[PDB]
């Protein structure tokens, strides 16, 4: 039989291991020859694996690179202008890679050039609330200062935007051992911790879903009209550079001015964590000087797009996509995900060679330039937006398969919750102590949902990966899954070696997943989801799950507003319309579900499958959210304070945020009421797509 | 048999006549009780005719009405402030209607209040080029002047925007006999010409597709958040009022200052048509004073929505819609169209009672508040936009059925050209001299297309009617048809009694269509189109017709640009990408057509029908045109100079318009290039929707 079990049994840990080794021997930085060569390799292998068509889709997009002959670094300079301390020019390469060339040195992609000199201010994680504390409570002014911020908690681009709005003239980002060194584990190569010379690369754009900075809304093709750099979307206006904690300790240890306001501002280095500005008495005439000489350059990138044509509904697309470009070797990010995709294509291709085809078309994508702002997936989606919005069933992302070895992690639209529960009950747990038990059982035990015992946690999607254009711009049901750490016992962020030269094949094979069993489990989950979405007669979406979450989110945003009861009375701010819409959605979804379970008629089937497919689409508002036109989903958007986190009812949440500080409360509360109307209208409109059609 | 011929034979001229008489005995102004009563009547009759469901959809939208106890008028005032001449307070009512109450006096809907006094400037038709001639050539300054403009040539709202941008402090609109009095015909009630006391009502908004001024983007429902008047969309900022030519002659005859620049500025009154400003010597101390006291008021409106559920594809909608609200009795506009709709519903309902249903759902709409800015159709479309964009097959409008008795007039998307040619060849000509000949034959003979002998003219859609939201915002294939005048021998605009109290049942029955044969023919065309769209197995759209027109429009916009060959060299302005896209569309459309003619498979059928339905949809750009976010179609938009006229490649056309006058040519030509890229990308993207799907 050609069924899901055939598909799943064909997947092999040993193949994932071979592919991961093959993908991680040299760097594959976006825009470089090595990454184009890997694109061509994947294209060739996907054809040989059996796909119907495999093409490269290229675009010319703005990328950013250091200057090879004028390196970036930071100094402490004395009053004569002598540079008495310089930060490292590169991370010490790991064992056996000390002769690899083309390792890009640490830098903040898209930083402008500059050599600002000034006094330091330490701003903790540079979150909105850290700047509130400095400015409103401590009365410290960042204007014209260089800010030093520890990485962690929020996306680094939000940190830079926050520093820029505080008036900083430069930003220094560093990895504190508090956030990137797990107690009792050794530094690489002897364990999976970040050494003191390790540094996290990463872009600092604030694109808000735009894709290539020069061509928002349209693909960066051969004839595209490009904005000038001055009108580009999302570029920072002050220089930024990241460093490791050996160098950070040298910059922090001399800090004077005010003490940290409390312990949540103190990391683990043996320094006071004084906020500044500037250095203590003896060193008060020294300054910090940045030297940034990176250049932005329009550069060609290549996505690989593989198609497995559907047998019955070839005009319905189920997409499995993840990126191929890496900062250096990409041992976890992205190649542990790309190796899994490669083995999924291989298994579907084995069935295809035996005469099978899925019911719907499956598209497989190896995206480029994800690390520079989701550029490859976004430009391809801009090019293909009309096909995707009328034909796109679902998008499953496939970046890193592992960021720990403790339990499963899934983030997805509520429409896929039931599919995920059902699939995980049919899969074997790879965990020690749960041999013979389902993945659902081990996941639920290790990661209980806050809401319902006997259920596992499933998070909302935010952003910071290639599902963003599909979900938040286009309204295509999306999901992602990976193995993760124990979040209770682990206070570090992501994994310690994230975006460092130390993320290697050896890291994964020695410390994370020697048997490749967690990779295999992730391949089964991602692949199983794609198989069900592409093969189930009725799409495997449950609209009743959206009804349950919408009520939860309406309760949550109502509770935020009710912190301001006098203003709600004064301005007549009512959530009645929103709860009415959610009640109506609940009722209509319940009736739709009964019809779905109660109808030999392929027109009623497909009519019903179209209602299921366009339900996520109904949450899109073609006018976008305020000042963020490419975030169009009214229920979910990336948080305005942290692109990685999803926010629910984002339009109302942002209208309420810090509202007690607004100088015109009438205007501010009017905008809250406007966002409640938009949300209530959209929920009701989405509900009505599920009503009988005529 | 239940076929198109059964449907068409059931239509009766005598029924259209009875319904027109019934709809035109009292005024049905939007927002008034009489119009709500007619809504309820139509709803009841449509149910009795056999529709499956007939509902009212109400909204609360901004309307505008004169003050019953403080009438609007214009005066000439002497230097003492004595009003020595006043314009009429009402049109003399026609015979037998002198006791009808609730006839709204002439006014410009949405005019602000004011009593400006000043010197007159005569501005011909107040078109963009008339203001160019006054300002650039004649050096006449309109700043702080009252402008008097003759109606005709362009939408009155464009006239007001133009006057407002010239700095006028008020606008007086009047009907010149040159444009509203056909030589050799008598004034009403003895003929169909406009008498000297007749006045054309009409709104002066510039909504650019927004619908209700207070709720752009969202339906004006029970909980809507409304903008304040100061932020309302499209309201004029200076007072405006319309008058007839008896009163206009009294305002013009004293005009001094400069002579008219040439004969195209002279109408038919016995006055010099001097441009002014102000009056000749003896009268030079007199001024003109307006008194406008109209009020804008949020007011409930009601659409009637009837559904005839499809037998096979109930989730595909073919919509026949036209408005019900009138300025006064609405003898032509809209009741000659609404009577036709009523008889179409009756005929479909007869077949339905005999057991028939159409293949797809047909929706029938009686829209409200069309006269105040397309408000009823736009608010309903805003409410239902998700259903319409995923399910909407086509929209056929049904405003006035006649504006002359000479020949057919059709304006529609190229996708319906073949359908219209085929249908008209099967219909009987009602014209004298063509008895026994097809409507296609008489239409082609009387209204040849400029492009191909043996073919009839079919115009592009612009705006100024209820198809606007469906076509230009949502991208649903749309069309309209009516009987019209001989345009060569007739130099007047629209029909003379347009929007006057004289548009009555007697006007139509005595002068336009005594036998109701032109109405019947129009019912056959509109109804026949709806029948084919709702019943053909394969949707009756020919994509190859779009390819032919796209080439014509690309040639046209290239020719405009080539008036500036030096700038095209300097700024490297190339149309190569656009012609490439059009060539590719031509090739792909040809291959799609062969597949369409060459495939028992209902999935391939519906897949192909979906490609046909979403082809018009593919021309939509979700970012809209510049500063006009609700005009989203890239091939067609209402002209920025005349809402009634369609413009092709509007984004490029407006970037090129008057470009030689722009102060920064680099910037201006860059915007041309940007619009060429947007257009070429959209044409290619639309073509690719017709490629094989996987
Ligand atoms: C959830 O679904 C329900 C349908 O089950 C839907 O209920 C609808 O609510 C609207 C808004 O309340 C109702 O609107 C009323 O409609 C009647 C005519 O049918 C009007 O006469 C009412 O207006 C009068 O009363 C108003 C309220 O006090 C006055 O402000 C106004 O000036 C008028 O005097 C009013 O417009 C509608 O009838 C029901 N529809 C039903 C029951 O089918 C509800 O709106 C949905 N929720 C959301 C968020 O959409
Ligand atoms: C109409 O349809 C045709 C397809 O039949 C489509 O043709 C495509 O044109 C693009 C743009 O010209 C071609 O792009 C080239 O692709 C190759 C790789 O396949 C690249 O190497 C080329 O780039 C090099 O050369 C450029 C041009 O001088 C340089 O600027 C650049 O730096 C590189 O050196 C170039 O990107 C594409 O191959 C074809 N596709 C085909 C033939 O399938 C055409 O684009 C369509 N029209 C529109 C308006 O979309
Ligand atoms: O330009 C861009 O937008 C991104 C380009 C690039 N992209 C990435 O590098 N993306 C990485 C981002 C690495 C994430 C680092 N990170 C994660 C977070 C946390 O937010 C995640 C959302 O919460 C869901 C996790 N929830 C839990 C799951 C399990 C659990 N448990 O106890 O088993 C507990 C959980 N929990 O939240 O307590 N903060 N930082 C990726 O997506 O894999 C970049 O960010 O530089
Ligand atoms: O708020 C709004 O947007 C509108 C609300 C209201 N709406 C209307 O009143 N709509 C009327 C508008 C009345 C039209 C008056 N008018 C028409 C025109 C001409 O533009 C029409 C586009 O050209 C197509 C006609 N082409 C020809 C057809 C036949 C023919 N022949 O020789 O047989 C020749 C043609 N031709 O162009 O030479 N200028 N003014 C309606 O749509 O019926 C209003 O305008 O105040
Ligand atoms: C990764 O695996 C690929 C595919 O097996 C290797 O590429 C092949 O190399 C052999 C020997 O050089 C060639 O004859 C084939 O033409 C290649 N196949 C391709 C590109 O599809 C590649 O050598 C491996 N890379 C590493 C670092 O092990
Ligand atoms: C930090 O780096 C800078 C730049 O290379 C060093 O200063 C340079 O030193 C060389 C040789 O002494 C001089 O010729 C250049 O004039 C200096 N350039 C600048 C910009 O100062 C500095 O010596 C280094 N400091 C430490 C502690 O290593
Ligand atoms: C998840 O599995 C459950 C349990 O099998 C499915 O729910 C059943 O679906 C069948 C088939 O329609 C119904 O007849 C049963 O009554 C359902 N049982 C319930 C709701 O407890 C559910 O459909 C699956 N979800 C998917 C595939 O998305
Ligand atoms: C227009 O026609 C309608 C429908 O025939 C007339 O309304 C009917 O009036 C009769 C007699 O008053 C009533 O008993 C019915 O209840 C009405 N039917 C409806 C409203 O559907 C109406 O009188 C006619 N109007 C004019 C001006 O002739
Ligand atoms: C035009 O109308 C105005 C307004 O009604 C007339 O002026 C008014 O005349 C009455 C009676 O003579 C006075 O009591 C008011 O004071 C006047 N109002 C204003 C605003 O002037 C004027 O007489 C009329 N002119 C003509 C020629 O009929
Ligand atoms: C308009 O009528 C023409 C002539 O009948 C139709 O064109 C024919 O369509 C049939 C059926 O597919 C083809 O086999 C013929 O070859 C076509 N003849 C031609 C192109 O000359 C055309 O499809 C009709 N258009 C509609 C209904 O939109
Ligand atoms: C890199 O090094 C120096 C900086 O001025 C110079 O030789 C060259 O222009 C730089 N390359 C760039 C800016 O791309
Ligand atoms: C911070 O310092 C700058 C530079 O001197 C000054 O212009 C700015 O207004 C100050 N702001 C506050 C809040 O102190
Ligand atoms: C792998 O699992 C073991 C067992 O709990 C754990 O102690 C170790 O920390 C894990 N490795 C990683 C990288 O998390
Ligand atoms: C109409 O007439 C006068 C104008 O001031 C006044 O009695 C009443 O307020 C007006 N009605 C309005 C403005 O709606
Ligand atoms: C027109 O007249 C006004 C008012 O005196 C003046 O402000 C304006 O600038 C003038 N413009 C031109 C072009 O003469
Ligand atoms: C109706 O037709 C006759 C015959 O040509 C024509 O002379 C008359 O002008 C027409 N009536 C109208 C209103 O156009
Ligand atoms: Ca782009
Ligand atoms: Ca609205
Ligand atoms: Cl992922
Ligand atoms: Cl019409
Ligand atoms: Zn990644
Ligand atoms: Zn990454
Ligand atoms: Zn009308
Ligand atoms: Zn009208």
From Swiss-Prot, chains A, B:
Q: What is the effect of changing residue 584 to A?
A: Loss of glycosylation. Abolishes enzyme activity
The entry's stated outcome for residue 323 to A/G/Q is: Complete loss of activity
Look up and give the membrane topology term.
Single-pass type II membrane protein
Residues with glycosylation annotation: 22, 67, 86, 99, 141, 282, 405, 422, 584
Sequence segments annotated as region (NAALADase): 220-533
The impact of changing residue 334 to A is: No effect on enzyme activity
BP term (GO), one:
folic acid-containing compound metabolic process
This protein's assembly is summarised as: Homodimer.
Name this protein carries in UniProt: Glutamate carboxypeptidase 2
Q: From which organism does this entry originate?
A: Homo sapiens
